[PDB]
Design a protein around this nucleic acid. Structure first.
Ligand code: K
Ligand code: SM
Ligand code: SM
Ligand code: SM
Ligand code: SM
Length: 341
DNA sequence: ACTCTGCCTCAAGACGGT
DNA sequence: TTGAGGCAGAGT
DNA sequence: ACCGTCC
């Protein structure tokens, strides 16, 4: 994401953050970063440190989360479209090499904690090694089809396509925890949208327009600010944190100008800094064409959903069947059948 | 006093019966 | 993966 | 709401 962004917004842009009750969202459409939500289920949904799985050893945590949460959203008249990641931008290569480095380190550690039967430390490294795979994505897509819930494949970053869907008015907001979605220009970001039966946190909306107003920036300058906070796509300036980045952006407006003014002895810039390229990425990312697919929420295929979730994945038939009935009735309540003229 | 860095730990879901 | 925080200790 | 269990 962008290091410190959420906090910075709370501290110096408090009014960009609006809370509303789940009841106010009846009828609203939202774009969800599917990979991130899958990740949250893999990580969270363990029984005895082990994922849920069917008897043939296949993981089912992601299916559990994405079946039941999606239905809860629909019960509240919230209509989600799931967006899946595509090929990462080249600028991300450095950051990805870093990740694989940590994954390598985590693999080593896992192995040892195993030898020393450190079952508690083994659970640590296992979690750290959690990875959303292509099979996880394909299985969720399959599930969503059966559920009648639309999904889209982004050409590159999913959060950029979510942003694009919001700007185009195809959904109300991008539901994600990753603030770089705002950096990609999303007018609205919603966090904590799970529609939990036992809500723990309130539904939050971040309005880009309020953010730009409070900080007194335009979007170019806001992207430059985020770049200075620290993004996945290039280096930041050592010694320049949230407090100073804000001051410098407000004073100088652009990173180029910030370079021309910084004392190169005190604040040397990264070597061959790619800020200009990352700036370009955030403002003009590769995104799907939001005029291309028409989002629709369709009738759930009950019998196939039972064969897949129950027959193959070994979910309780009563729960699944009950889930499908609720989903079907809730769609009926929030959705108009197609009309021809 | 204020800022930042680098180091640490920690959580992260949902259902049904009670 | 995304946050959340805390710590000392060094820089401004 | 708590908590054993889910697959
Ligand atoms: K920095
Ligand atoms: Sm991101
Ligand atoms: Sm992404
Ligand atoms: Sm089978
Ligand atoms: Sm199988």
């Amino acid at each position: 994401g962008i290091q410190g962004l959420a906090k910075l917004i709370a501290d110096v842009a408090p009014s960009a953050i609006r809370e509303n009750d789940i009841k106010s969202y009846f009828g609203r459409k939202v774009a969800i970063d599917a990979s991130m939500s899958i990740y949250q289920f893999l990580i969270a949904v363990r029984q005895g440190g082990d994922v849920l799985q069917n008897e043939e050893g296949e993981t089912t945590s992601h299916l559990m989360g994405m079946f039941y949460r999606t239905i809860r959203m629909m019960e509240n008249g919230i209509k989600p479209v799931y967006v899946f990641d595509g090929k990462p931008p080249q600028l991300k290569s450095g950051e990805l090499a870093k990740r694989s480095e940590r994954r390598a380190e985590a693999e080593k550690q896992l192995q040892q904690a195993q030898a020393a039967g450190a079952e508690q430390e083994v659970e640590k490294f296992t979690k750290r090694l959690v990875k959303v795979t292509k099979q996880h994505n394909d299985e969720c897509k399959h599930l969503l089809s059966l559920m009648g819930i639309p999904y889209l494949d982004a050409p590159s970053e999913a959060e950029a396509s979510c942003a694009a869907l919001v700007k185009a008015g195809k959904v109300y907001a991008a539901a994600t925890e990753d603030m770089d979605c705002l950096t990609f220009g999303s007018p609205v970001l919603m966090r904590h949208l799970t529609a939990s039966e036992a809500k723990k946190l309130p539904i939050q909306e971040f309005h880009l327009s309020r953010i730009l107003q409070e900080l007194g920036l335009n979007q170019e300058q806001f992207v430059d600010l985020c770049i200075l906070l620290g993004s996945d796509y290039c280096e930041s300036i050592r010694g320049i944190g949230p407090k100073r980045a804000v001051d410098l952006i407000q004073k100088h407006k652009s990173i180029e100008e910030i370079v021309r003014r910084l004392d190169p002895n005190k604040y040397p810039v990264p070597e061959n800094w790619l800020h200009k390229e990352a700036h370009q990425l955030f403002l003009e990312p590769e995104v799907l064409d939001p005029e291309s697919v028409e989002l629709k929420w369709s009738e759930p295929n009950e019998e196939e959903l039972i064969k897949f979730m129950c027959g193959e994945k070994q979910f309780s038939e009563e729960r699944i069947r009950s889930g499908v009935k609720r989903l079907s009735k809730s769609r009926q309540g929030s959705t108009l059948e197609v009309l021809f003229q």
